[PDB]
Amino acid sequence: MDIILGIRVQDSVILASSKAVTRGISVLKDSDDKTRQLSPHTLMSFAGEAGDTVQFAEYIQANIQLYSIREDYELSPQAVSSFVRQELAKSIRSRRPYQVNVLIGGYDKKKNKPELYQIDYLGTKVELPYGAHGYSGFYTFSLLDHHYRPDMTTEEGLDLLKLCVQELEKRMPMDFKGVIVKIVDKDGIRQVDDF
Template identity: 70%
Template sequence: MDVILGIKLRDCVIIATSKAATRGISVLRADDDKTRQLSEHSLMAFTGESGDTVQFAEYIQANIQLYDIRENYELSPSAIASFTRNELAKSLRSRKPYQVNVLIGGYDTVKKETKLNWLDYLGTNIELPYAAHGYAAFYTTSLLDRHYREDLNTEEGLELLKLCVKELETRMPVDFKGLLVKIIDNDGVRVVDF
């Protein structure tokens, strides 16, 4: 029942995740954060089996931070997505593969551009202008196809996200307890009051 959305804009990336943590038909928490900050300018949103998601996200976060400490160099969002894809692909060949779908958004401080990568549990990695996992993909993809433009600024991106939320609230039979929205830009990662 998770909602994971990402929109790449001209100057930032917007990542939105549902606040509800569910198990079956029960809502366990109404303030869950399904994201992990991987570096100063990159963020990972995840969905999937509850144990796998947290364990995998913390594993990726720890390895990215370890690389940053050892090399004194922040990995680009593309490099982080490549590392994450490699870890998902390796786990697929193990006895207990991770059942995790991921969005990685970030701002490349060297190239001065935004990045949004869509990864699934099979190790597929693709860079997209907008992406969704979970039930959000069923209801918002056509809306994003229709209204997305490459030159959107932050305010216009948040308005597009509001259209997506309205569609989700109308169509989804479950209350996902609202969205936690984070923006990644040149200044880093910040939470937006949405």
């Protein structure tokens, strides 16, 4: 799929992901949710080749859910991100690699800190205050470099995110049909229904 954005503010992580799904020359769906909840305080958005994205995300989801039940304990965002990276690094040298790029947004309940991890299909992990995959960063990183502070509120994070989407909508040739925005904080994961 096309565009996935992420931003880590003071007390939360915000993920924005496009709604479009295209086969051939036709947009089949304009309300697609490119994300899976890995645990109550960990959300993963994804983008890449058709089919591989959902299969990979659901496979990761199942493994983390299995861990949660076995230990009766939620893995830290850092631990989950490392697990995901290894699976992608394992995948890239397989017969047929999974062509999937992800952003992992989580709230660490132990440290009381939001955390955003960017991982590409090769298994390249980086912790960031804000991130993106594909061409999305080319348009948005200049705005984020300018406006971003680490002490921003969730509302200010959403306003800066709106500005990023507006820039994408102006200068990108592709119509990605807007974004679904989700917020990850101490209380869990919720969706912003009006954006």
